[PDB]
Copies of this chain bind each other. A is one copy, B any other.
């Protein structure tokens, strides 16, 4: 069975406590569900299921994937669920939605991810009761999203471990970070993000604001980048500049069979050729994309040289340089419009976010074979091969 991506859309990536500071994730997810339906000419009443990845849904209510589907007009007869594979959630949900059609259980699937790291609350177990002494209010964003559960340190420390084995210097990681900021700024100026971004209306206060530009894209320098202090180790190289940030946003895609798209006259954004997920050492979780991409290319019958465009998520400059050095693909075809260092990193949605950038760049330049991949906390990776029609 051949499954294609009929359409795709994403919101602008908002800053931490920025444009989407008081916007729940399902509200961002509802906008993207409506957009992928409008861009493909498919009504909300035709959706069988909505599958949205989300890592931090605490305090948002019962099944935020169902809340986003309801507000987008998807009828009550359909189903909706969320899933959590950390940073690979947004891309895995696309593969999960693909399998719904491959097994014959659904026809039209809206798959992607949504995340509101700004709305992540502080929690504390209080049922037993704190009779005496102080107790900690746990940040769910740090605890459930950014801290390794086996070794106890942040995901930035894992980038320090990757920097040690590959011997990646501070100046090399800053050169990668500056390159990402300059490619993302150039892509924003030329309007290459307009096709994939759907505007979001932030209701509240006294005026309604339309958000249609990635809020982190502002540019940077090499003199101001090397003056930053390391945020994870006193003698480390990972700083706040060469590492991805905390962001809000959503991204999704409309899935259907290749024969179904031909019957509707739809021109798909690409054909899902294969996907893969593999685990690695949690100490070097940034290496996830290395075996995940290899297995994805092996299942597709492709070689590394056959790829025309690559979207490798830039969780950290240290891990991103390590993946490129091992796979050896042409770095000029990897993240041609910037990466998460400049655009942002909403964990649950980034998987579908970089899939949107991959699909719309493959369309404008005429690329035939593409690949998207991300590293996953806890020692995992996920990749997917896309081919045009």
Which A residues are within 8 Å of any B CB, using their own CB? 1, 16-17, 21-22, 49, 57-67, 70, 75-86, 89, 92, 96, 99-100, 102-103, 105, 118-150, 246, 275-282, 377-380
Assess the A62–B145 pair: CB atoms within 8 A.
yes
Given known contacts A62-B377, A84-B81, A76 and B282 CB-to-CB distance under 8 angstroms: yes
Assess the B149–A61 pair: CB atoms within 8 A.
yes
Q: Which residue in B63, B146, B279 is a CB contact (below 8 Å) of A378?
A: B63
Assess the A121–B120 pair: CB atoms within 8 A.
no
Given known contacts A67-B150, A136-B134, A82 and B79 CB-to-CB distance under 8 angstroms: no
A143 to chain B, nearest CB (A): 6
How far, in whole Å, are A79 and B65 apart by their CA atoms in the complex?
23
How far, in whole Å, are A196 and B139 apart by their CA atoms in the complex?
37
Q: Which residues in B have their C-beta under 8 angstroms from that of A379?
A: 66, 76
How far, in whole Å, are A92 and B149 apart by their CA atoms in the complex?
25
A49 to chain B, nearest CB (A): 7
How far, in whole Å, are A80 and B57 apart by their CA atoms in the complex?
18
How far, in whole Å, are A49 and B149 apart by their CA atoms in the complex?
18
Given known contacts A49-B277, A129-B130, A144-B60, A84 and B86 CB-to-CB distance under 8 angstroms: no
Query: Can you pick out 27 interface pairs between chain A and chain B where the beta carbons lie within 8 Å of each other?
Result: A49-B277, A57-B144, A61-B143, A61-B144, A62-B145, A63-B85, A66-B379, A75-B279, A76-B281, A76-B379, A77-B278, A78-B279, A82-B84, A82-B85, A83-B84, A99-B102, A105-B276, A119-B127, A122-B130, A123-B124, A123-B140, A126-B126, A126-B137, A127-B131, A128-B129, A130-B139, A133-B142
